[PDB]
Amino acid sequence: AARLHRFKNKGKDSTEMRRRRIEVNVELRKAKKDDQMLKRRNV
Amino acid sequence: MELITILEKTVSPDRLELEAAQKFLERAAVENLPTFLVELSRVLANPGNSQVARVAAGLQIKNSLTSKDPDIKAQYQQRWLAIDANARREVKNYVLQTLGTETYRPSSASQCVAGIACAEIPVNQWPELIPQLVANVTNPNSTEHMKESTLEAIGYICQDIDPEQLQDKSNEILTAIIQGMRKEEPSNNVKLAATNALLNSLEFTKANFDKESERHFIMQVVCEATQCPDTRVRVAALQNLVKIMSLYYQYMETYMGPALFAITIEAMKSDIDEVALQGIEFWSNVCDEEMDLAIEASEAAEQGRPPEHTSKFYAKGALQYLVPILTQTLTKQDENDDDDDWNPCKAAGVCLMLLATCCEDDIVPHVLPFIKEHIKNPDWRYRDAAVMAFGCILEGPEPSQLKPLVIQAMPTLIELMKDPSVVVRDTAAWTVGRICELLPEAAINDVYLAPLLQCLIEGLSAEPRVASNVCWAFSSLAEAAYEAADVADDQEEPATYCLSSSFELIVQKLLETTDRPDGHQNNLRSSAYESLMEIVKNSAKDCYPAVQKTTLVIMERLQQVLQMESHIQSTSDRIQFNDLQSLLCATLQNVLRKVQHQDALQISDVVMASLLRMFQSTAGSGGVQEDALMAVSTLVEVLGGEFLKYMEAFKPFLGIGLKNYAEYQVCLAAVGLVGDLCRALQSNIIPFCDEVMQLLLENLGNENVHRSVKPQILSVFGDIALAIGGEFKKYLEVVLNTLQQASQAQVDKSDYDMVDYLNELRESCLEAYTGIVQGLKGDQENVHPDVMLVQPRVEFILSFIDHIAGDEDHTDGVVACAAGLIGDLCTAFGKDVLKLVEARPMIHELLTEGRRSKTNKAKTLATWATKELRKLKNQA
């Protein structure tokens, strides 16, 4: 097999969708730190 | 007392003596291990005994040392080595002489050779194995059973053991394989073993394929192997052909491709499914690689460097033959087709997607006529193929040309959703969802929007086979509508979008379809819950009362799930229960981010009480424990400083999660939550800072944790220093020494995965230093009297960043972090750092390169660095 996860959104499932959520949270936290440090930088 | 008598109990339905004898022989296997091994080998080597008894004995020998688990296999290997050398010789000769003599097709003796050699080869034992096997194959007087057994063992060797130990012996074994592949061999069973052996041994012969004469001979035997009367040799030879495509593509130019082009096309056209599958896979792998090399060619072109390796555009040249066949084979499905089943029709449909991506514009002229003709044909097979082909063409070509076609074919799409055949309805739901994701301009328009919603909501009550598929279309439509509205009033949330009219209706339908009794099939419940999450996340201002109603329902379902925890009776029930809990927490996270502060306060008490109950009842896997962690994290972010009322109850569970060496992902989530906790509850984490500091240091002390945990430990150290302020002097020296030790680490440059790990470690180290300096900088315009505490270590700081600037392996993040540091010590100390950077003038390359990077982070921070540096460059 190794290709069935491409046919008609069959790949989308609990494990795959959890991975996308985790990366979303990490990106949001990383972005939040950026502007908070930017404003404290006084520039 | 003969071992054959007890061996027959293994195959007999009675098993009372099965386990009894097995445990007795296992007690022998630990105490009288040479005795048990020798007697078993003697029985296997006796042709007079029943051959089923010999097979049973061979199974015992294999199971005595083989193991699927790598750790169990490793200790079993050490157990084998822990025996007298003469004792192992008593059975090594028996195994190497028993094979082939048995008149069986399975040839269980080949398994025994595989297990012993996979352990003795690493320790350079049994040096006569390879010469003996080669002699057996190459001997002209060998019988069919002799050769069939030997090739089976060779393939078992290549598959099982690692490729490192056979790199030097690859040339010897290859000559044996191709000798059994030539057409002069009478039997086909031997030829089948030869093809199978070469499949698992293609990695060893990298140097052999480099040779020209060897390569030409190698493909000659496999090409003549495909055109064979039998089918098993035919399919097996094709799998060999696709593997060579995937790795040794460069050498295919020299008349290699013109030979394969005839065989592969015929293979796809064949009515037999297996040969058709391999033909499709071969023409999909070339497209898959062609995409990757095209990326490399563009990257080199934009960098001004000639490409490392180029392509010949095989897929582009031969598309006019693949497309007519690929469309035709789509009309081969059956109404009673399993959803989880690899078929030539499914493979053809998937392959069409990569065809579109490889060639964006050249595909449409060869597929548009087909879909036009068979879009209304009475047979549902051809109607299904036409609509399925429509979805694949969306990705590749430029949407500007596609707009006339999609807008013209929209009226025929909606009526297809009411086709009497469920299969056509399923494909219709998929293709309308794709048309929304890729071409939302045609989907969001006044004429077609209202009928689209009418059919979409109507489909939510259909059978699960299509009901799951249409649900994902709703999520795509909501995202398109949310992006369609552009308020541009700095509010960042549009007041009203096209979905505002019937927002409450579709939300109500998604709520009830989740509670369907048959949501297990086709992951209907999992799909339905997620589209609800995307709907709520993509809600507008007007839908505020609607999202308030959904929060009440979601909270109600959480309390219900508590009761289902008490009663459980099966493992499958546990899996369903855990999945439901994970989805419910996922939805709660999204609604909490959307809801206003006022409503967050009243429901916070119930949310925390339910969340801690899930963590307390750790009767399941780590998914429930992990999910509750970041669920609290998003609650803290939206609550602000009001979370202080929950510190006394959250403290014991935070320590439990932090002190857990197993489940490294769960420990990772707890670490991330600490950083959010200090940010929101700033200047108030002091009573809880000492415990989390000690717990973090203990986890950093040991080594058997996952490597990914370490960098985040350093990042939270810097964030804590920023939050607490000047009170970090208690642990200032300890964290500084730990950071200094971790910073001076070097790993081999060849391993890219180690390179990325070390680069991420560098980023966390740099970010920690920025937080350390900012902690003592203070809010006031002047430097605080605590900033000289880190003064002695400034020289090591500049030496470290100089080391980073020396390496060309710097990524886009390390440069930004380093530039942020340089500005920080520039504004923290002042006059003294001018001499320090003077002694290391090579840092200027980092300052200039910080602006050339496309990332705005490096440009802004380096601009700050050069601005303040120039103040001290000409201050007098």
Mind giving me the DSSP string for B55-95? HHHHHHHHHTT--SSHHHHHHHHHHHHSS-HHHHHHHHHHH
Collect all residues of chain A within an 8 Å Cβ-Cβ radius of residue B857: 34
| Chain B CB within 8 Å of residue A37 CB | yes
- Tokens 């009309």 -> residue: B331
How many secondary structure helices (H) and strands (E) does chain A include? 1, 0
CA quadruple B270, B271, B275, B281: dihedral, nearest 10: 80
Please list, in sequence order, all residues whose beta carbon lies within 8 angstroms of the beta carbon of residue B673, skipping any fewer than 6 positions away: B629, B630, B632, B633, B636, B654
- How far is CA B517 from its chain centroid? 32
Total residues belonging to chain B? 876
* Number of cross-chain residue pairs from A and B with Cβ atoms under 8 Å apart: 55
| Chain A CB within 8 Å of residue B350 CB | yes
Q: Where are the domains of chain A?
A: 4-40
Distances (CA, A) of B280 to B313, B377, B396: 18, 26, 20
Count CB atoms within 10 A of the CB of residue B375: 18
Minimal C-alpha gap between A35 and chain B (Å): 10
Minimal C-alpha gap between B645 and chain A (Å): 23
Collect all residues of chain A within an 8 Å Cβ-Cβ radius of residue B622: none
Count CB atoms within 10 A of the CB of residue B92: 20
Inter-residue long-range contacts of B573-578, CB under 8 Å, 24+ positions, other chains counted: B574/B620, B576/B520, B577/B620, B578/B620, B578/B621, B578/B623, B578/B624
Q: Tell me how far apart the alpha carbons of residues B873 and B876 are, in angstroms, rounded to a whole number.
A: 8
The two structure tokens encoding residue B486: 């552009």
Distances (CA, A) of B836 to B772, B796, B830, B833: 20, 11, 11, 5
Q: What is the resolution of this structure in A?
A: 3.3
Q: Tell me B492's DSSP state.
A: S
The HSE-up count of residue B518 (CA atoms within 13 Å, CB side) is 10
- Closest listed residue to residue B696, CA positions, set B717, B675, B666: B717
- Closest listed residue to residue B221, CA positions, set B246, B241, B207, B201: B241
> Who among A3, A14, A37 is closest to B526 (CB)?
A14
Minimal C-alpha gap between A10 and chain B (Å): 9
Inter-residue contact B463 to B422 (CB < 8 Å): yes
Q: Tell me how far apart the alpha carbons of residues B407 and B443 are, in angstroms, rounded to a whole number.
A: 8
Q: Tell me how far apart the alpha carbons of residues B111 and B447 are, in angstroms, rounded to a whole number.
A: 69
Q: Tell me how far apart the alpha carbons of residues B527 and B583 are, in angstroms, rounded to a whole number.
A: 10
Q: Tell me how far apart the alpha carbons of residues B731 and B728 are, in angstroms, rounded to a whole number.
A: 6
Q: Tell me B541's DSSP state.
A: S
Among chain A residues, the shortest Cα distance to B533 is held by: A21
Among chain B residues, the shortest Cα distance to A17 is held by: B530
The one-letter code for the residue type at B52 is: V
Minimal C-alpha gap between B572 and chain A (Å): 15
Q: Tell me A43's DSSP state.
A: -
Q: Tell me how far apart the alpha carbons of residues B541 and B366 are, in angstroms, rounded to a whole number.
A: 46
φ, ψ of residue B698 to 5 degrees: the values are -65, -40
- Closest listed residue to residue B111, CA positions, set B172, B162, B57: B57
Inspect the interface and report whether the beta carbons of B353 and A6 lie closer than 8 Å.
yes
* Burial (CB count within 10 angstroms: exposed 0-12, middle 13-18, buried 19+), residue B205: buried
The HSE-up count of residue B620 (CA atoms within 13 Å, CB side) is 26
Q: Tell me how far apart the alpha carbons of residues B509 and B89 are, in angstroms, rounded to a whole number.
A: 73
- Closest listed residue to residue B381, CA positions, set B443, B317, B439, B427: B427
- Closest listed residue to residue B202, CA positions, set B246, B233, B250, B232: B246
Inter-residue contact B522 to B551 (CB < 8 Å): no
Total residues belonging to chain A? 43
Q: Tell me how far apart the alpha carbons of residues B471 and B697 are, in angstroms, rounded to a whole number.
A: 47
Q: Tell me how far apart the alpha carbons of residues B635 and B585 are, in angstroms, rounded to a whole number.
A: 12
3-state secondary structure of B46: coil
The two structure tokens encoding residue B835: 């001499």
Testing the interface with A: which of B532, B855, B861 to mutate, by most A Cβ within 10 A? B861
Among chain A residues, the shortest Cα distance to B856 is held by: A34
Q: What DSSP assignment string belongs to B395-454? A: TSS-HHHHHHHHHHHHHHHHHHTT-S-HHHHHHHHHHHHHHHHH-HHHHSSHHHHHHHHH
- Closest listed residue to residue B814, CA positions, set B868, B872, B853, B863: B853
Please list, in sequence order, all residues whose beta carbon lies within 8 angstroms of the beta carbon of residue B131, skipping any fewer than 6 positions away: none
Inter-residue contact B811 to B759 (CB < 8 Å): yes
> Who among B523, B526, B630 is closest to A25 (CB)?
B630
Inter-residue contact B435 to B428 (CB < 8 Å): no
B100: left (phi over 0), alpha (psi -120 to 50) or beta: left
φ, ψ of residue B462 to 5 degrees: the values are -80, -175
The two structure tokens encoding residue B39: 């007697």
Inspect the interface and report whether the beta carbons of B633 and A26 lie closer than 8 Å.
no
The one-letter code for the residue type at B176 is: A
Minimal C-alpha gap between B630 and chain A (Å): 8
Check the CA dihedral B222-B226-B229-B235 and report its sign: positive
3-state secondary structure of B683: coil
Q: Tell me how far apart the alpha carbons of residues B481 and B704 are, in angstroms, rounded to a whole number.
A: 49
- How far is CA B478 from its chain centroid? 28
Inspect the interface and report whether the beta carbons of A8 and B430 lie closer than 8 Å.
yes
Please list, in sequence order, all residues whose beta carbon lies within 8 angstroms of the beta carbon of residue B871, skipping any fewer than 6 positions away: none
Inspect the interface and report whether the beta carbons of B586 and A40 lie closer than 8 Å.
no
Q: Tell me how far apart the alpha carbons of residues B551 and B591 are, in angstroms, rounded to a whole number.
A: 7
- How far is CA B650 from its chain centroid? 33
Inter-residue contact B388 to B332 (CB < 8 Å): no
Q: Tell me how far apart the alpha carbons of residues B726 and B779 are, in angstroms, rounded to a whole number.
A: 11
Q: Tell me how far apart the alpha carbons of residues B356 and B570 are, in angstroms, rounded to a whole number.
A: 46
Among chain A residues, the shortest Cα distance to B581 is held by: A14
Q: Tell me how far apart the alpha carbons of residues B171 and B689 are, in angstroms, rounded to a whole number.
A: 63
Inspect the interface and report whether the beta carbons of A26 and B672 lie closer than 8 Å.
yes
Inspect the interface and report whether the beta carbons of A8 and B860 lie closer than 8 Å.
no
| Chain B CB within 8 Å of residue A15 CB | no
Among chain B residues, the shortest Cα distance to A6 is held by: B350
- How far is CA B675 from its chain centroid? 27
**CATH code assigned to B15-876:** 1.25.10.10
Inter-residue contact B205 to B170 (CB < 8 Å): yes
- Closest listed residue to residue B846, CA positions, set B866, B832, B826: B866
Distances (CA, A) of B152 to B192, B230, B476, B705, B743: 10, 19, 52, 41, 51
The one-letter code for the residue type at B15 is: R
Element containing residue B345 per DSSP (H, E)? helix B344-358
3-state secondary structure of B717: helix
The one-letter code for the residue type at B685 is: I
Q: Tell me how far apart the alpha carbons of residues B233 and B315 are, in angstroms, rounded to a whole number.
A: 27
Q: Detail the DSSP E strand segments found in B705-817.
A: none
The HSE-up count of residue B649 (CA atoms within 13 Å, CB side) is 14
| Chain B CB within 8 Å of residue A29 CB | yes
Q: Where are the domains of chain B?
A: 15-876
Distances (CA, A) of B648 to B678, B685, B688: 15, 12, 10
The two structure tokens encoding residue B484: 């369609």
Count CB atoms within 10 A of the CB of residue B143: 12
Collect all residues of chain A within an 8 Å Cβ-Cβ radius of residue B582: 14, 18
Q: Tell me how far apart the alpha carbons of residues B218 and B591 are, in angstroms, rounded to a whole number.
A: 62
